[PDB]
Design a protein around this ligand. Sequence first.
Ligand SMILES: CC(=O)N[C@@H]1[C@@H](O[C@@H]2O[C@@H](C)[C@@H](O)[C@@H](O)[C@@H]2O)[C@H](O[C@@H]2O[C@H](CO)[C@H](O)[C@H](O[C@]3(C(=O)O)C[C@H](O)[C@@H](NC(C)=O)[C@H]([C@H](O)[C@H](O)CO)O3)[C@H]2O)[C@@H](CO)O[C@H]1O
Ligand SMILES: CC(=O)N[C@@H]1[C@@H](O[C@@H]2O[C@@H](C)[C@@H](O)[C@@H](O)[C@@H]2O)[C@H](O[C@@H]2O[C@H](CO)[C@H](O)[C@H](O[C@]3(C(=O)O)C[C@H](O)[C@@H](NC(C)=O)[C@H]([C@H](O)[C@H](O)CO)O3)[C@H]2O)[C@@H](CO)O[C@H]1O
Ligand code: CL
Ligand code: CL
Ligand code: CL
Ligand code: CL
Lengths: 194, 192
Amino acid sequence: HNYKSLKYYYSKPSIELKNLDGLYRQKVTDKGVYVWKDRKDYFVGLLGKDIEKYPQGEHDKQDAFLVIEEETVNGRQYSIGGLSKTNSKEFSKEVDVKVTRKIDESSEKSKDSKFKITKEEISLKELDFKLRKKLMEEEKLYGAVNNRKGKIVVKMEDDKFYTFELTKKLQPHRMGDTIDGTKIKEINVELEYK
Amino acid sequence: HNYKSLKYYYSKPSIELKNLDGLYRQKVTDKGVYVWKDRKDYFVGLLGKDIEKYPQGEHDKQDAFLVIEEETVNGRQYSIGGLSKTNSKEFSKEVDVKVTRKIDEEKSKDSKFKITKEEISLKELDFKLRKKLMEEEKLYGAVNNRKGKIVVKMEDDKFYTFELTKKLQPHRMGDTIDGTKIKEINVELEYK
Ligand SMILES: CC(=O)N[C@@H]1[C@@H](O[C@@H]2O[C@@H](C)[C@@H](O)[C@@H](O)[C@@H]2O)[C@H](O[C@@H]2O[C@H](CO)[C@H](O)[C@H](O[C@]3(C(=O)O)C[C@H](O)[C@@H](NC(C)=O)[C@H]([C@H](O)[C@H](O)CO)O3)[C@H]2O)[C@@H](CO)O[C@H]1O
Ligand SMILES: CC(=O)N[C@@H]1[C@@H](O[C@@H]2O[C@@H](C)[C@@H](O)[C@@H](O)[C@@H]2O)[C@H](O[C@@H]2O[C@H](CO)[C@H](O)[C@H](O[C@]3(C(=O)O)C[C@H](O)[C@@H](NC(C)=O)[C@H]([C@H](O)[C@H](O)CO)O3)[C@H]2O)[C@@H](CO)O[C@H]1O
Ligand SMILES: [Cl-]
Ligand SMILES: [Cl-]
Ligand SMILES: [Cl-]
Ligand SMILES: [Cl-]
């Protein structure tokens, strides 16, 4: 799958729900949870290791980063992953974003920018979505069919990293993975298009 | 994962739909396809590269092996993987199944497994073979009866393994193999 799907998913708005009123794993055989805040409810798929994070019952102090999928599930609007523990305190860390952009087959230009991390525990879904939007706005990502190549690498304070490939949508089973936002050190982006 | 989720999936009945009336990938955005036969329609999920077998549009000459999930999707019953090309010719082969206990004395109890499809999903092989073991070898009959493996061996020694302590993974449910090239099935049970 390529340009058409990418431009389509990444052009959707997201819904950021902090301090959910509910996050309920009705039964162990459900591959998702019911989430709600105020008067809007959703079914959220747990398609990765996140299924182990929310066993049968109610779960308090959670946030949800939703991007409404095309399919209805259990008669509700559906989103995949994007669940995380809510902040125990206000948090905001600015990290460097190094962008390396193709000029031609021989050279590349380096530009620097910043990105703010406002959650203590953040899902890969949310990082991936926000960083690609940032690139759609500032670097013409998905502005043309040729503008789809490269990657985003989130580097942590230790040797760990996480990569988002610009040629494909983040995979469902990775959307529920979370990382410690307080330990994100820098973000490096390689854009392989003029 | 635990005995409870294993027993729950493999104790389900399957619905085998040969010669589907249709299979349809509606938008390229969708993460599965619609299948239907005789006024019943279903939505079938396809993970990873399994979705690439069915580009946007309608596809004929397909079979579906369905195990209904708890979720409804687009108002339809849902299943994961299990799609394959229907037979172009008649085919049937009785494959030896050799069951050995890896605990005590070791000797195998042998039986046969009938293959009738030229192209067969790992979902179907996995599901039918574990069901055969539940019926003949007490698989999942007690919490300690869940260790071992099933190995599907091909004519050229390629093989596919199903570990009995876990449910077949969703990305493998949509994988297909050549039914005509299955040579034998070897099972190891690690419970008494
Ligand atoms: C066809 C396809 O999509 N296959 C999936 C895998 O992607 C494919 O294979 C990998 C190796 C790459 O070549 C992909 O470009 C290729 O499409 C997928 O593997 C995961 O792919 C992503 C990028 O999409 C990434 O490379 C993952 O590697 C890391 C990462 O950089 O993100 C490697 C890091 O060391 C690791 N970090 C830590 C702390 O362990 C992370 C981390 O495990 C994940 O990011 C957490 O979600 O992964 C690579 O695993 C594969 C698994 O998602 O699924 C295939 O279907
Ligand atoms: C934690 C987890 O579930 N990880 C998944 C992998 O399983 C883990 O690692 C493997 C190597 C085993 O040790 C598992 O016990 C362990 O959970 C998973 O790997 C795939 O696991 C299955 C068993 O579940 C199997 O070993 C696969 O290897 C083979 C196979 O024997 O079936 C190796 C064969 O040579 C190969 N055959 C051919 C013709 O290439 C097959 C074949 O590719 C697949 O059967 C087709 O589906 O694979 C092993 O790859 C991994 C990939 O599915 O997912 C991890 O999440
Ligand atoms: Cl529905
Ligand atoms: Cl990715
Ligand atoms: Cl890097
Ligand atoms: Cl397995």
